[PDB]
């Protein structure tokens, strides 16, 4: 094995405690996991952490008015050793 994105579904109400998101009820946030090399190629050995983070589009209400917006860096899209 190696370092990479692992799927992880997050439920807003159950896992984040957010009761105000109308849709979606949850989403694939994912996370980084996996072995990296002993040494570095440009303290401690390298770690498997997120590289590209993407945003998530949600729908919620303020008063009786629906609002569609997006939260940045909600989805781990790629991982890197470092």
């Amino acid at each position: 094995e190696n370092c990479c994105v692992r799927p992880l579904y997050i439920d807003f109400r159950q896992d984040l405690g957010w009761k105000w998101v109308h849709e979606p009820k949850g989403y694939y946030a994912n996370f980084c996991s996996g072995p990296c090399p002993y040494l570095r190629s440009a303290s401690a050995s390298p770690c498997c952490v997120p590289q590209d983070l993407e945003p998530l589009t949600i729908l919620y209400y303020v008063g009786r008015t629906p609002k569609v917006e997006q939260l940045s860096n909600m989805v781990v899209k790629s991982c890197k050793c470092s």
């Binding site: 209400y61 303020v62 009786r64």
Partner: protein, 106 residues
């Protein structure tokens, strides 16, 4: 920030029940900080409706006072209204108007 069910007026089958779920899928962030949750249940000779909204307790609603606003639960109290049976409650904990209770809790 206060969260409340906010489906405005909807038909309901809540009747001859000690308590009822609002079945409202809209949980809203009240747009003004002092607003609390409200639920209004009414039955006329044709149907039953349940209204859920956020509302400022310093203001009348259907011309009545929201006297129970500090309460964490929505305990329905009857209001005199000709030609129908009218009950209302207000409360101030998140989604508290999702569960409406008739008469007092056991």
């Amino acid at each position: 920030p206060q969260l409340c069910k906010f489906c405005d007026v909807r038909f309901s089958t809540c009747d001859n029940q000690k308590s009822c779920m609002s079945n409202c899928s809209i949980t809203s962030i009240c747009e003004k900080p002092q607003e609390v949750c409200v639920a209004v249940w009414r039955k006329n000779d044709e149907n039953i409706t349940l209204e859920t909204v956020c509302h400022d307790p310093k203001l009348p609603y259907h011309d009545f006072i929201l006297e129970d606003a500090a309460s964490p639960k929505c305990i329905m109290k009857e209001k005199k209204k000709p030609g129908e049976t009218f009950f209302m409650c207000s409360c101030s904990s998140d989604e508290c108007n999702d569960n409406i209770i008739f008469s007092e809790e056991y």
